[PDB]
């Protein structure tokens, strides 16, 4: 995948892109490293969406802006605007979300 590392770079990819899904994760978080390999699989499978991970400790300002309160959090951005938000490490729950916009 690709990991965002600044506020400028973050809004850039929500701007100059139509469908983008984001993984908000922490290095010290169990369930966010656990659902992390399964996330890499949908990266290739659903190319009708650009997959990105944001470290929550690292891009402090983005994490304050998206209202991230628990990891892992998944947010779907369409045309530059957040439309869906999923909290959890359920592989099943994530598959139902990415299919809602890509497939």
């Amino acid at each position: 995948v690709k990991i965002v590392t600044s506020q400028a770079e973050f809004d850039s990819i929500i701007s100059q892109n139509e469908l983008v899904i984001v993984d908000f994760f922490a290095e010290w978080c169990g369930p966010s490293k656990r659902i992390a390999p399964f996330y890499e699989e949908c990266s290739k499978t659903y190319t009708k969406m650009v997959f990105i991970k944001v470290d929550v400790d690292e891009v402090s300002e983005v994490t304050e802006k998206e209202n991230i309160t628990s990891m892992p959090t998944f947010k779907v951005y369409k045309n530059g605007s957040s439309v869906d938000t999923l909290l959890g490490a359920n592989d099943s729950a994530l598959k139902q979300l990415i299919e809602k916009y890509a497939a």
């Binding site: 922490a26 010290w28 978080c29 169990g30 369930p31 966010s32 309160t69 628990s70 990891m71």
Partner: protein, 483 residues
């Protein structure tokens, strides 16, 4: 009128000894009998009663053995400790336990002779309202008699194995047997839903044994069910299986194992069956019918008033053997001591049975004092009771990633949220609850908890900032973490 002794007590348990020692310090000539009738499996022990030999003491020691096991297995790796070939030796543990019990036997004995209480290792019973006939060493060859100005019955209780289950009495063990068991317990069925059952299941499982608990209905009757459930649940996570609503109907020995057939017609092989379904008053050999002393079944317990009087004016009962008195050692001891003073020191104290604190040594511990949520609703009405609570993570546990803990207060809205119920689930429950129990007896209010400064970091400080209420309908789940 002349008597051999001023006070003769039957029972060298906590109540009997306390009542005897105390009466001797206020001038009395005291004689105390203690003899131990063998268990279903023919097990016996020294002086002291249930607590020291086959109760609180060896229970707490084995709990510590098992709690230790859980630390090695669940937390040690996260904390940097490495080791190989971890195993536990049942025989070694039993010798450590029994050896320390034997030391307590000795000190209890020398304690009696220091207090100037005559001790006879004899099986005793009632002749008449001022006469006790004893059998020295429990032999029926030589009967003796002695008279007393006052007689105290403190014979306690024994575990009850049911009559109407085939092979139970002949095949199962009880708490009288477990703390001295010569064999490894092996795969174990525990029948019963009492704290004894839960505690034994707890340590045997922490020790590393395949443990099943046959429970009917619900665990810890009388306790706060939210806590009771949290405790059960935690035990399930640690490995103890519960067969809910099923109990053994037949037990059969075969090949040094026990085949158990349950009510639901299913059947299972075990190495050991431990019955822990309740204890009964040890009065049968006391010849009480002859004085027409009123007793209760199926407690098989003596009816005593608030002053520990039976319907025979020279006879009294304290502790386990007495109907409706909490079966805790400190309770027997205080009642004993108070009776001794009313009798031989002209005291007008009355034993207070309210707000008695207690603590269960299950793999997650639970301490309590006062009313449960439900019983408070029942007696005061739901709309007049506020319940403050909070689930939270123990700091040392939550860093392992193996809610652990619950802090719950029960209050009376119409007495300025004065606290009438305290319940805590988590580590070191007994240590947390003691000071809280005292606070409840001082008629503490919820705002007093709020103005007390907390000790950080501790599980106990959770009671000092408790603000979610049941009727707020807000969440009291543990936050984090990650999250």
């Amino acid at each position: 009128h002349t008597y051999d002794y001023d006070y003769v007590v039957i029972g060298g348990g906590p109540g009997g000894m306390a009542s005897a020692k105390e009466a001797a310090a206020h001038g009395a000539r005291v004689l105390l009998f203690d003899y131990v009738k063998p268990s279903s499996q023919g097990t016996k022990w020294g002086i002291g009663g249930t607590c020291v030999n086959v109760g609180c003491v060896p229970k707490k020691l084995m709990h510590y053995a098992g709690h230790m096991g859980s630390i090695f297995k669940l937390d040690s790796k996260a904390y940097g400790w490495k080791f190989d070939n971890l195993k536990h030796d049942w025989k070694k543990l039993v010798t450590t336990v029994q050896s320390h019990i034997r030391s307590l036997n000795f000190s209890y004995m020398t304690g009696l002779r220091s207090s100037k209480v005559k001790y006879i290792n004899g099986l005793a019973k009632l002749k008449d309202k001022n006469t006790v006939s004893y059998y020295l060493k429990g032999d029926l060859s030589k009967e003796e008699t002695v008279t007393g100005k006052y007689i105290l019955i403190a014979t306690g209780c024994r575990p009850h194995i049911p009559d109407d289950v085939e092979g139970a009495k002949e095949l199962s063990i009880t708490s009288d047997d477990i703390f001295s068991l010569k064999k490894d317990p092996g795969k174990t069925l525990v029948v019963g839903a009492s704290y004894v059952a839960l505690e034994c299941s707890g340590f045997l499982n922490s020790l590393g044994y395949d443990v099943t608990v046959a429970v009917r209905s619900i665990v810890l009757r009388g306790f706060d069910q939210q806590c009771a459930v949290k405790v059960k649940l935690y035990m399930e996570e640690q490995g103890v299986m519960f067969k809910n609503g099923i109990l053994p109907k037949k037990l059969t020995k075969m090949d040094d194992k026990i085949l158990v057939e349950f009510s639901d017609k299913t059947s299972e092989l075990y190495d050991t069956v431990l019955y822990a379904i309740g204890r009964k008053g040890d009065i049968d050999g006391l010849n009480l019918e002859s004085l027409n002393m009123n007793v209760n079944k199926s407690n098989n317990k003596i009816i005593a008033d608030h002053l520990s009087c039976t319907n025979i004016p020279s006879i009294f009962a304290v502790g386990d053997v007495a109907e409706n008195v909490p079966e805790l050692a400190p309770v027997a001891i205080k009642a004993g001591e108070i009776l001794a003073r009313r009798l031989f020191k002209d005291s007008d104290e009355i034993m207070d049975y309210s707000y008695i604190p207690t603590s269960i040594y299950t793999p997650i511990e639970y301490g309590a004092c006062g009313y449960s949520e439900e019983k408070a609703y029942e007696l005061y009405g739901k709309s007049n009771v506020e319940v403050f609570l909070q689930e939270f993570n123990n700091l040392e546990i939550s860093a392992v990633h193996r809610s652990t803990c619950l802090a719950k207060l029960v209050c009376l809205k119409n007495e300025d949220n004065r606290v009438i119920g305290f319940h805590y689930v988590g580590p070191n429950a007994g240590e947390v609850t003691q000071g809280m129990a005292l606070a409840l007896r001082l008629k503490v209010k919820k705002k007093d908890f709020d103005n007390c400064i907390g000790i950080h970091p501790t599980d106990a400080e959770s009671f000092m900032n408790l603000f979610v209420t049941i009727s707020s309908g807000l969440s009291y789940a543990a936050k984090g973490g990650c999250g």
